[PDB]
């Protein structure tokens, strides 16, 4: 916890930013439920609403996760 938290800061790993992005998703949910009066019906309409606003957020988080795991393993990258 001591040494590697220094590496985060030293290397400018946007670690706190990722965490805060989660918290913003948590917040978006909380604010949305209180405003709506209740949402289970329709759940899919809210799923459509979000994807429309953030069409590639989930996709790109998966992309970067895979790339971070690959980097951490030291895998050799090629283009095409």
């Amino acid at each position: 916890n001591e040494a590697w938290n220094g590496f985060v800061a030293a290397a400018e790993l946007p670690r706190n930013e990722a965490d805060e992005l989660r918290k913003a998703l948590d917040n978006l949910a909380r604010q949305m439920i209180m405003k709506d009066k209740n949402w289970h019906d329709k759940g899919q309409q809210y799923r459509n609403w979000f994807l429309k606003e953030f069409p590639r957020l989930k996709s790109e988080l998966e992309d970067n996760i895979r790339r971070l795991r690959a980097l951490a393993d030291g895998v050799q990258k090629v283009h095409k």
């Epitope: 998966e62 992309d63 996760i65 895979r66 790339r67 795991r69 690959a70 951490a72 393993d73 030291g74 895998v75 050799q76 990258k77 090629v78 283009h79 095409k80």
Partner: antibody
Framework: QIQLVQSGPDLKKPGETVKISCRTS????????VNWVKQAPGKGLKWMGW????????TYAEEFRGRFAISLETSASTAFLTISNLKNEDSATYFC??????????????WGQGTTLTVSS | DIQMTQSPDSLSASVGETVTITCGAS??????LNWYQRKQGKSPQLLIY???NLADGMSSRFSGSRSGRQYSLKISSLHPDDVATYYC?????????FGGGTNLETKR
């Protein structure tokens, strides 16, 4: 054409050492990784480990930490699997395969023909 | 380490039928999943990478799909030369663990 050609089948006694060669051709050897896979009798495939053909970093599955060593002869575009202190359960067919990472996905895209090792007295 | 649970252990189908084989990852692997085909006495060959991408040179009859932690390999129209053992593989982080394999046979 891309090719990985492995050394031939071998019979070894328990305790001995074997070196399995994987001679590659048809691509930039130091741009792709090499990993090794153990084929047990039946269906089983066990991923063994990987070597970085540029840096020389290796990574092994837990099961293969002790007696297994992956090495290189870059000038010959060749990778080696050396197994020391051969034990009874080392009898298997071993595969080398190129490891490609295209920036998104990681896979063994080209494979050697395999090397069948028998450990017996 | 990530466990890959493959199902079924074996199955058989008639030429022209569609086949589905599935693979469960012990945790989310975010699409980092390969399928391999291993014909008897032959080296495994890459079939699918990135869960859904057809390896170059392989038949379009093969396709991959994903639902959460569940990955599926589909053959749309079984051919006799599809007889093989099929393996999923965790390709997210090392070790790149293989599933136990699914044997596919043909009925005739």
């Amino acid at each position: 054409q891309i090719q990985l050609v492995q050394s031939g089948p071998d019979l070894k006694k328990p305790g001995e050492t074997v070196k399995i060669s994987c001679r590659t051709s048809g691509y930039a050897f130091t741009n792709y990784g090499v990993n090794w896979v153990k084929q047990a009798p039946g269906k089983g495939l066990k991923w063994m480990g990987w070597i970085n053909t540029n840096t020389g970093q290796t990574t092994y599955a837990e099961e293969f930490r002790g007696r297994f060593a992956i090495s290189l002869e870059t000038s010959a575009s060749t990778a080696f699997l050396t197994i020391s202190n051969l034990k009874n359960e080392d009898s298997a067919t071993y595969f080398c395969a190129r490891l490609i990472y295209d920036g998104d996905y990681i896979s063994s895209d080209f494979w050697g023909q395999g090397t069948t090792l028998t450990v017996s007295s | 380490d990530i466990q890959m649970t493959q199902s079924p252990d074996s199955l058989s189908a008639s030429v022209g039928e569609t086949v589905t084989i599935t693979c469960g990852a012990s945790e989310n692997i975010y699409g980092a999943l390969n399928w391999y085909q291993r014909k008897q006495g032959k080296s495994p060959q890459l079939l699918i990478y990135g869960a859904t991408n057809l390896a170059d040179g392989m038949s379009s009859r093969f396709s991959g799909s994903r639902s959460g932690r569940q990955y599926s390999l589909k053959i749309s129209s079984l051919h006799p030369d599809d007889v093989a053992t099929y393996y999923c593989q965790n390709a997210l982080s090392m070790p790149y663990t293989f599933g136990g394999g699914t044997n596919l046979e043909t009925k005739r």
